[PDB]
Amino acid sequence: FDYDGPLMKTEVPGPRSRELMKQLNIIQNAEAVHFFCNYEESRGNYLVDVDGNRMLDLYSQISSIPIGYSHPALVKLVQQPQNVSTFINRPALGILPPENFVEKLRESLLSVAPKGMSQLITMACGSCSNENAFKTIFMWYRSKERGQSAFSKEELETCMINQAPGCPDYSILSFMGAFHGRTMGCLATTHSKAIHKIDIPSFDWPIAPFPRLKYPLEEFVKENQQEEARCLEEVEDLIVKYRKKKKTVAGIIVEPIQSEGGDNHASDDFFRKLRDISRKHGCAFLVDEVQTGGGSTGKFWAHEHWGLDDPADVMTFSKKMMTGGFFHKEEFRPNAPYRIFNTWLGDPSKNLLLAEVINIIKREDLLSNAAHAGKVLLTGLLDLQARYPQFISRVRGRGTFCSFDTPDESIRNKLISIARNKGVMLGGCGDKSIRFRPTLVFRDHHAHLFLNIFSDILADF
């Protein structure tokens, strides 16, 4: 169930939004607010605001709405009397799971488990997923080092007062341009934008360059090969260097496509080799699919494109999946309870919704659709690039996970602002990139719709 197209009544934000923004701004900093929404009237690919504006939404709540707004299948779930308890009786999942906990996982997350990962722990968001993935990894590394032995007396004592060896000085290696969340652990592995990091205490952990590809890809085969090789070499040197500082790299975290930092792509070959380096040095390979996961790249998990039997040790997710969590190998299973733990560890209401979302994704063939719609989108972007090289460059994407650069931040923001007033919600990333994160009910006719409007925008620009 969708609308037929966008319909604008006012500039955005409109008067009602500006009123609500003023109210909210009393209680908190509200400068980030785009506008206030009428989710009750929003349907499919279209977001409706409080001023009656109806926009084609290619941002999708920062890539977190899987099958559009007010999806009728999800409506039905909420209407079912049997499901009331799930929404009002939130369990401490770690100790008192509901009867249907395992079965609902079987119909949801377990049905899309990545290769070689039999374990699953749930979490409420992307950040606690990565934080607990870090801890899982640190525990695995020490377990690997201590063998099947008991905790030492020294370790039990020192860990309580934040000291080695109880609290080891181990590191997680991350990449420039990365985004993994903003809690203090995640934040150390994030390198997206200075405003995200500044004034916050961090960790002295190794930071490697992520490949900056040159476009068009077919004119820079050798240059891109060399850029990737250079980055891989630098990763390995950092691992070695930090082993020597006694700040042993216990794991490596990477996005299959860097998002907040500017939609940075690398070849599948790059990731396969990175995974090999991880294994070579005994580093856990942690793949962050919080934003790439959920099918928009044309495969459920973006890392599937790599074609590996053993793609990773740990994989985190959230956003689109409604709930957070992480898959991992059996060998990363915590040895004892109450190490990886928190009150809620997700929410059964989200699992309830997710099971239906995955059913829709499968029955409506939405992975293939993302590849196709994404192809149409990318083709049109390439055509616009050819027509407006003064405004558009480095057009790139996989599935509907697409983007392009503009000449500077100011132009980027202006084009987003114009597009929004014209009926299209676009996202920005990095300093000067515009990104696309359509929901999985985005079809080729939506791509054409968008390409038409943006086409006129560029001619008028």
Ligand X SMILES: *Cc1c(COP(=O)(O)O)cnc(C)c1O
Active site residues: 179, 288, 319, 343
User: Nearest distance from residue 181's CB to ligand FES, in Å?
Assistant: 8
User: Nearest distance from residue 307's CB to ligand FES, in Å?
Assistant: 32
142 belongs to an annotated ligand binding site: no
Burial call 89-105: b when 16+ CB within 10 Å, e when fewer: eebebbeeeeeeeeebb
The residues facing 288 across adjacent strands are 316
The residues facing 317 across adjacent strands are 325
Are the C-beta atoms of residues 4 and 446 closer than 8 Å to each other? no
User: Nearest distance from residue 119's CB to a copy of itself, in Å?
Assistant: 6
Find where tokens 């060896």 sit.
Answer: 165
Q: How far is CA 168 from CA 55, 163, 197, 283, 389, in A?
A: 50, 8, 24, 15, 51
Q: Map residues 287-326 to x or -, x wherever contact with ligand FES holds by CB under 6 A.
A: ----------------------------------------
Span 118-177, contacts to a copy of itself by CB under 8 A: 118-121, 124-128, 131-132, 134-135, 138-139, 141-143, 151, 155-157, 159-163, 166-171, 176
Q: Among residues 6, 18, 44, 47, which is the contact residue for a copy of itself, using CB under 8 A?
A: 47
Residue 116 binds to a copy of itself (criterion: CB under 8 A) = no
3-state secondary structure of 174: strand
Residue 124 binds to ligand FES (criterion: CB under 6 A) = yes
Give 199-203's long-range contacts (Cβ < 8 A, gap of 24+): 203/171
Residue 183 binds to ligand FES (criterion: CB under 6 A) = yes
125 belongs to an annotated ligand binding site: yes
Q: How far apart are CA 459 and CA 461, in angstroms?
A: 5
Q: Which residues bind ligand X (CB under 6 A)?
A: 125-127, 130, 179-181, 255, 259, 288, 290-291, 318-319, 342-344
Residue 451 binds to ligand FES (criterion: CB under 6 A) = no
User: Nearest distance from residue 1's CB to a copy of itself, in Å?
Assistant: 12
Judged by CB under 6 A, which stretch of 80-88, 123-131, 393-401, 413-421 contacts ligand FES?
A: 123-131
CB atoms within 10 A of CB 386: 10
Are the C-beta atoms of residues 34 and 450 closer than 8 Å to each other? no
Count of positions on this chain that bind a copy of itself (CB under 8 A): 128
Find where tokens 């699992």 sit.
Answer: 351
End-to-end, the C-alpha distance of the chain in Å comes to 34
The first and second tokens of residue 126, run together, are 């992307």
Residue 199 binds to a copy of itself (criterion: CB under 8 A) = yes
Burial class of residue 200 (count of CB atoms within 10 Å of its CB; 0-12, 13-18, 19+): exposed
The dihedral built from the CA positions of residue 339, 319, 294 and 208, taken in this order, carries a sign that is negative
Helix (H) or strand (E) run with residue 173 in it: strand 171-175
Span 377-436, contacts to ligand FES by CB under 6 A: none
Span 270-329, contacts to a copy of itself by CB under 8 A: 318-319, 322
Are the C-beta atoms of residues 224 and 267 closer than 8 Å to each other? yes
343 belongs to an annotated ligand binding site: yes
Residue 340 binds to ligand FES (criterion: CB under 6 A) = no
Contacted by 150, from ligand FES, a copy of itself, ligand X, none: CB < 5 to 8 Å by type:
none
Binding-site residues for [2Fe-2S] cluster? 125, 128
Q: Which residues are annotated as a binding site for pyridoxal 5'-phosphate?
A: 126-127, 343
Q: Which residues are annotated as a binding site?
A: 125-128, 182, 343
Binding site for ligand FES (CB under 6 A): 123-125, 127-128, 183
